[PDB]
């Protein structure tokens, strides 16, 4: 369990310095917590940068798109910093940070790919969910193309299967802006 | 559990000497393949004589079932179908695909038609491939029913969107069977 | 497991005397076995009575209606004999024996009631299955009215809940014709 | 199951039938099939019904009991170990003067067990039925034992175990036998 | 897990001081009742000020959800709804039932509408009672959506027969929300 | 881990805040735990002010009859009027507690479902024991029905007939049956 | 307990009867057991008559690659032509065995589904061990593709591209792809 | 289930092929499966000591003690036991294959043959861990020596090549010395 | 279980070959015993060939087999065909003098008995005492058949002790290691 | 968790951080939060990172490793029990000249574990990635130990356990300390 | 657990530390944290370490042993129930002259337990390592008991159970203590 300082828990103390963590999978709970923290920080000061550290294998697309929209929505710039892994919705959040303020530590791993899903039921219902998952796939691809500056087709091609990049490769792909090794 | 008759046979083996075959319970690879084996056997014994295929099934796997349908249409002998209890999903498809004029049901049978079920989990690309395939199959099954019942394809499509239960006399008016028979005497 | 005589199993030996057993629940397997035996017996001789002993708590309506239709369909009269319990599809099979040849031993229990079922899913699908189960209920009631000579309404009223009768009460209701205590 | 056909079929050829283990639809029906079959082979010769059973389903058991009374042959009963619940009912329902027990057997009588979950209306219905069954079971015992109904009602309120001689004194069996060579 | 702010509050308690309330995850008795409590509280603090109800929910129990809908319409303050991720089943119903003109969604939200689910097992009589009830409720829910979206009832009925997914801009054209907002600045 | 929580200045949550205003919630199934919580709150409010009305919001599928009858009795027992408000479902013991609110102070919001029906139970055991519990569940069925008859004003026979199976009512039908007094749609209205 | 069964005059079932006519079935998943049964039957038929064709009916979703390749090899190995008939599904190893039937003697009934795709596997362990099994599953993927390329007449590259994901074909499309030679609808036709 | 052939004397398919001195190891090596093979071998020898026996193998391997008994029996009985791989021969499976009669070890063209070291392990006291560790090391060395002898490879080469799972196609197996011939068709 | 002109085990039984294969339990032990008694009925003076591939198992069941081997007239020769550990290695060593065989690749293991009791101190004491008696008798049986001193056996069975076939011969657990039938 | 706030927070006030038990996203993030926080309080004072860990998730661990290099303060590391897998990587990545171990500690290095089930194409992709990760992990160790890459590759093929002095000799730590009072 | 501060934190104000129950990473690390803290508060004052434990993980437990040897304060140990496996090794590793046991305690010693599943190669590595560990703990026992290594080895082959008086005689503790006043 979490350490206390001065009386805050450790994460509360960092929140005081506008530092937010996404750690582990993206689900409704973890997404909402991040969103509440971002809204809180904007309330505290709508002009100061926020620092959003990411270490996530991804998870639920709808939960994650909420976090992503909240980032574009609030007034403060949201700088992103990958501190281990950003895959699936992880990489999308990372790449959706404020322009020029997307970072990774040197040894992180970044992974992009297409949506996973599935429905059992009537042919009719499978059609409906298959069409919708196809729309979602196209729209995630368009968010990646926008943030990376890659062509849509390039994004499509590169997400067909699990695509793993080191920090330096992700910066060259446009998923982030800087690899940082030292505070200095 | 199956009683024996004597030079010893089980009850089903004995009824098979009279060209009676059953499909009972779920359509799966095991049960469908058994029927196919019997039909091939019956054809081998006599190419001309009717076969009597008693059906009481909630349906099951489409591919397994379609093997039985193709075998019925394939072999020389006429396969007469008789519903005895239930024919639903692939069950009613097999019922409807019996020899022209030789599709029967006992008075209390329930007959149900509807669209295929399935679904996959996986990458969106995989889900797309399987979605398209289930659509082709849904289409092909409706065309089978249209052909055997005499209904328009569009009518079939409308009527199988959700589960559709029919009494024996309604299934006859619909074209899924030819005769409702209540008495061997009649 | 089952005894051998002379080489038959015990049930095979009785089948030689046109005796068929329904024992335990009605399902696709037990129903089909009975049906195959009835068809077999008619094949052997289409004019001799068949004796169909019942001890069943009932079970699946579609499986059971097949057995019932097969009884009315084949040429031989099918006499019925309750030897313990006939409830649900059990009582319906018993009562559907050949006119004047429906029997029970003195201590049997006979039970009638309405259909049980259920579906989870969309409102639309629940409607479809609710309508169908209502048709089935009405038609079972009409089979009982026919065989007992009771009014439809009487059958409806008396099957609303589990209705238990001793052998003598079932004979007075018309579910059977005779209570027999001794072969003589 | 030794071959000699199995051992039980060899004994069936000498008009010997076993009820061993619980009464359920399967074990009860098997017995009924053996009784109808013995009647069919010879309608006048005695039948020998060996019972070792903790009992079980009432309806399945009552079918066996009724068949015993229905067929022409006398069904002589013999307890070999335990006759409890439906077990003691079948033992006691044997042919007059021909109910036996090996000496170390236990015989237990008691009231029906059951129960339903659901609406009160349905519980009431099932309560009334089991109460009827309770009563009929008592009357069957009063009949085969020669005991007053009131006595049976009282003696079956809770589990009641008897040794073989006690079951004889009570009217559940006619004889305790120790040796075949004894008259 | 919920961070604290200082005289100490959890993050949600703090946002509640700004009249922000969340419904997140499934609608059940627990989550619905929490929202109701907050709405009653917010009304008590100030009867006139807008409340901002952020929704991200796949839906859930109809009765629990309808308590939240009635409470929104009941209390003095306007409840403004903002979809942030997903609004489906009861979720989209709550979204659509926000104050007139004050129903929003972020650009990437998915909004889905459809008919109720349920079902009972039991006696046919019981199944009939519950079947009729689910039909009344299905009807009442469609009438709620018709009223808030401005669509004809018949249109609603057609469009909720099966799951119906909409992007934010489609939900606005449909009437489920009033505005798509991408930027606090705009 | 309660929510949302203002700490002491183990925590002060939204329910404790509302309880400060004599607002009590029964949410979810009625069992020994949830019933006793309500009782404790009712007694405490009576202790703070005997005169002032209490507002009892109900959203419940019901549950255990004994636990529920403690709540019903407590409501009648304490000095304050206990106003009932249905905010989603009042089924089984739920609907009984709703109907047992102070006279003329029983409310529902417009979309609530109110359901009445007979008790459910069950016992496995000896015939004797089944007889005993069968008689008892019938006395309780009778008592529950008498309670509803008293608060609705229907005849007992009417209650009996209407509860033989699940009986769903909308809020307006509940008012016309006498289970609540007012359907309220808006605070200002 | 086999079916349906004529005893000796442990039993003589419908499959044994049909085997008397050189008819063999692969039904359901391909595993060590089901594959070996087919092999045994094939060897036995070769022993009874080396010259006479064998009729191999397939209805299978496929399964284990090693077990399946024994069947494929045995078919090519024995003297008799082995005719293949698809009677429902030939997927995965199923479709391979179908395509591997004697030249010009590979059939499907009209409604069959034929599916081809790449192998599936998986290993948990040390990087080294994952490397080894990864290389191997790629050699096998290559071999499977070469087999289909040989029997269909497609170029290897075509096979590779067409099997990257599940690829469903109707019977007539399977014939045009070269996986079977004839779609047969009627015995007399 | 297993088909039947009548002569009336009914036997299952496997018994019928046994009349032609054909034996199958199919699936995992364990006490039950190894023993049946051994019983058959003993039976075939008694029936005719001189005639070759055909041992078809499709096996992922399994229990080493069970396997070594089959192996010892092959070497022990008078008749030559010819081995044919039909699918897979891994672990004890490849050992049994390779241990067939000199020049009469076959595989079909698509078989995979895999060799590697033994697996096991005990849980308990350090003393027992030690005892079992020493044993499994002897067994590892013995197994290696056995392959070396049948393949003709030198011991060190075997050791190097079995440190991790090592998968071979049939032709690579012939070249390694695990089998003598790859056969594609009966006529050739 | 293949059929040859009954099963292959029944066929090899016609030649006085018996297998213990897999663990020693009641069922598996009784089968062996039954076959020993049968082979004796058939021919009292003819040798029996007892094949062993066993991890051992239940001591009491095993001792029944061991005793039966010494009780019947026929010499029971033992052949280890893979593994003989625990009771397995005891049955191997208890074969007829000079007729104990192993194939070359067999593993043979001896150790002390394992057991378990939970309960009262008194009951633990009683069972502890008895397993110690049994440990002792087993060491005595091995000492007698090996030629080894009791104290050597005790030292050597304190923990699992694995021997290759030639080690077991040198130890005295078998008499011969055989590689080919002709030799 | 004793109060003095808990014991770990009291020590955090003296710039002491613990990694205890497996590395996963949760335990790794906690540490990172403590490192960013100490940097924030005082960017020049040394940090004391106590490690007792069997290791765990590579990505979670690499985040901790990177943060250690990124922050201004020197992160001095101390092994207190075990440092295996990611544990020995974090210990070894400590500030030059300031990597310590209590004397009885075990230090274990080895290659990555993983694996995927699925199509060959996907297995190939995951195989290549873990091979890259294997390599980078080796290069990190070669860097902090001063060892040749080839040496690391060979010494991590299988589990490799070292005692504290062996880990020092190997370059994984700088000092084995026994007493605080010792210089 | 009661509040006075919970009860344990209260006793910690007097430099009392409990190890109670199994030795694992969590319980071991708590103890180490308390040791370092107490050294921080006063580096000269004795610490009292009560031990009631069946033992458990060696690596976790040797962390505690080393921390005891390493901090400036003397660590006195007191067995109050059971000290088996790693438990008895912590008890025995107390400050010289300050190892106690209450009169009814059981102390037990024996060799380590473990064992891997896998390839022979891997089994051999973990076997060799557990044999080192075994020898190492044996030397520690010999060191603190004053016993010869051969003796420790012989006596820990199987579980060895001693009463408080037997343990003191064997050298695992210095004093059996029955009443605070005496
Ligand atoms: Mg922004
Ligand atoms: Mg035809
Ligand atoms: Mg008739
Ligand atoms: Mg009689
Ligand atoms: Mg409002
Ligand atoms: Mg009051
Ligand atoms: Mg060929
Ligand atoms: Mg040889
Ligand atoms: Mg002897
Ligand atoms: Mg640094
Ligand atoms: Mg010290």
From Swiss-Prot, chains B, E:
GO molecular function: ATP-dependent peptidase activity; ATPase binding; serine-type endopeptidase activity
Organism superkingdom: Bacteria
Cellular component GO terms, alphabetical: cytoplasm; endopeptidase Clp complex
Broad class of the protein's primary localization: cytoplasm
Disulphide-bridged cysteine pairs: none
Cited PROSITE patterns: CLP_PROTEASE_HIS, CLP_PROTEASE_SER
Record key words, sorted: Cytoplasm, Hydrolase, Protease, Serine protease
EC number: 3.4.21.92
Matching CDD domains: S14_ClpP_2 (cd07017)
Alphabetized InterPro entries for the sequence: ClpP, ClpP/crotonase-like_dom_sf, ClpP/TepA, ClpP_His_AS, ClpP_Ser_AS
Enzyme class, UniProt record, top EC level: hydrolase
Catalytic residues, chain numbering: 89, 114
Catalytic activity from the UniProt record: Hydrolysis of proteins to small peptides in the presence of ATP and magnesium. alpha-casein is the usual test substrate. In the absence of ATP, only oligopeptides shorter than five residues are hydrolyzed (such as succinyl-Leu-Tyr-|-NHMec, and Leu-Tyr-Leu-|-Tyr-Trp, in which cleavage of the -Tyr-|-Leu- and -Tyr-|-Trp bonds also occurs)
Record localization: Cytoplasm
A biological-process GO annotation: protein quality control for misfolded or incompletely synthesized proteins
Assembly notes: Fourteen ClpP subunits assemble into 2 heptameric rings which stack back to back to give a disk-like structure with a central cavity, resembling the structure of eukaryotic proteasomes.
Family label: Belongs to the peptidase S14 family.
HAMAP family registered for this protein in UniProt: ClpP
Role this protein plays: Cleaves peptides in various proteins in a process that requires ATP hydrolysis. Has a chymotrypsin-like activity. Plays a major role in the degradation of misfolded proteins.
Protein name as annotated: ATP-dependent Clp protease proteolytic subunit
Provenance organism: Francisella tularensis subsp. tularensis (strain SCHU S4 / Schu 4)
Gene designation per UniProt: clpP
Curated annotation (Swiss-Prot), chains F, G:
EC number, as in UniProt: 3.4.21.92
Main location: cytoplasm
Active-site residues, Swiss-Prot/TrEMBL: 92, 117
GO aspect biological process, one term: protein quality control for misfolded or incompletely synthesized proteins
Keyword Disulfide bond listed: no
A GO MF label: ATPase binding
Reaction catalysed by this enzyme: Hydrolysis of proteins to small peptides in the presence of ATP and magnesium. alpha-casein is the usual test substrate. In the absence of ATP, only oligopeptides shorter than five residues are hydrolyzed (such as succinyl-Leu-Tyr-|-NHMec, and Leu-Tyr-Leu-|-Tyr-Trp, in which cleavage of the -Tyr-|-Leu- and -Tyr-|-Trp bonds also occurs)
InterPro entries associated with the record: ClpP, ClpP/crotonase-like_dom_sf, ClpP/TepA, ClpP_His_AS, ClpP_Ser_AS
Function comment: Cleaves peptides in various proteins in a process that requires ATP hydrolysis. Has a chymotrypsin-like activity. Plays a major role in the degradation of misfolded proteins.
Subunit structure: Fourteen ClpP subunits assemble into 2 heptameric rings which stack back to back to give a disk-like structure with a central cavity, resembling the structure of eukaryotic proteasomes.
Protein name: ATP-dependent Clp protease proteolytic subunit
Native source organism of the sequence: Francisella tularensis subsp. tularensis (strain SCHU S4 / Schu 4)
Phylogenetic classification of the source organism: Bacteria, Pseudomonadati, Pseudomonadota, Gammaproteobacteria, Thiotrichales
UniProt gene name: clpP
Swiss-Prot record, chain K:
Reaction(s) the record says it catalyses: Hydrolysis of proteins to small peptides in the presence of ATP and magnesium. alpha-casein is the usual test substrate. In the absence of ATP, only oligopeptides shorter than five residues are hydrolyzed (such as succinyl-Leu-Tyr-|-NHMec, and Leu-Tyr-Leu-|-Tyr-Trp, in which cleavage of the -Tyr-|-Leu- and -Tyr-|-Trp bonds also occurs)
Coiled coil residues, start to end: none
Protein location: Cytoplasm
Gene Ontology CC: cytoplasm; endopeptidase Clp complex
InterPro entries in alphabetical order: ClpP (IPR001907), ClpP/crotonase-like_dom_sf (IPR029045), ClpP/TepA (IPR023562), ClpP_His_AS (IPR033135), ClpP_Ser_AS (IPR018215)
Enzyme class: hydrolase
Gene3D superfamilies: 2-enoyl-CoA Hydratase, Chain A, domain 1 (3.90.226.10)
Keyword Cytoplasm found: yes
GO BP: any one term: protein quality control for misfolded or incompletely synthesized proteins
Active site as annotated: 85, 110
UniProt keyword annotation of Amino-acid biosynthesis present: no
Keywords for the protein's UniProt record, in alphabetical order: Cytoplasm, Hydrolase, Protease, Serine protease
Pfam family, one: CLP_protease
Main location group: cytoplasm
SUPFAM superfamilies, sorted: ClpP/crotonase
EC number: 3.4.21.92
GO molecular function: ATP-dependent peptidase activity; ATPase binding; serine-type endopeptidase activity
Annotated family: Belongs to the peptidase S14 family.
Subunit structure of this chain's protein: Fourteen ClpP subunits assemble into 2 heptameric rings which stack back to back to give a disk-like structure with a central cavity, resembling the structure of eukaryotic proteasomes.
Physiological role: Cleaves peptides in various proteins in a process that requires ATP hydrolysis. Has a chymotrypsin-like activity. Plays a major role in the degradation of misfolded proteins.
Name of the protein this chain belongs to: ATP-dependent Clp protease proteolytic subunit
Gene encoding the protein: clpP
């Amino acid at each position: 369990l979490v350490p206390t300082v001065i009386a805050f828990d450790i994460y509360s103390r960092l929140l005081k310095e506008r530092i937010v963590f996404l750690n582990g999978e993206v689900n409704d709970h973890s997404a909402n917590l991040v969103i509440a923290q971002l809204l809180f920080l904007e309330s505290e000061d709508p002009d100061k940068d926020i620092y959003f550290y990411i270490n996530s294998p991804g998870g639920m697309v709808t939960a994650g798109m909420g976090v992503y929209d909240t980032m574009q929505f609030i007034k403060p710039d949201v700088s992103t910093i990958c501190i281990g892994l950003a895959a699936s919705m992880g990489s999308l959040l990372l790449a959706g940070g404020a322009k020029g303020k997307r970072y990774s530590l040197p040894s992180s791993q970044i992974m992009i790919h297409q949506p996973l899903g599935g429905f059992r039921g009537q042919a009719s219902d499978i059609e409906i969910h298959a069409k919708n998952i196809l729309r979602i796939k196209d729209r995630l691809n368009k968010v990646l193309a926008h943030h990376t500056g890659q062509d849509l087709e390039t994004i499509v091609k590169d997400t067909d299967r699990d695509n793993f990049m080191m920090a330096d490769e992700a910066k060259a792909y446009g998923l982030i802006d800087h690899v940082i090794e030292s505070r200095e």
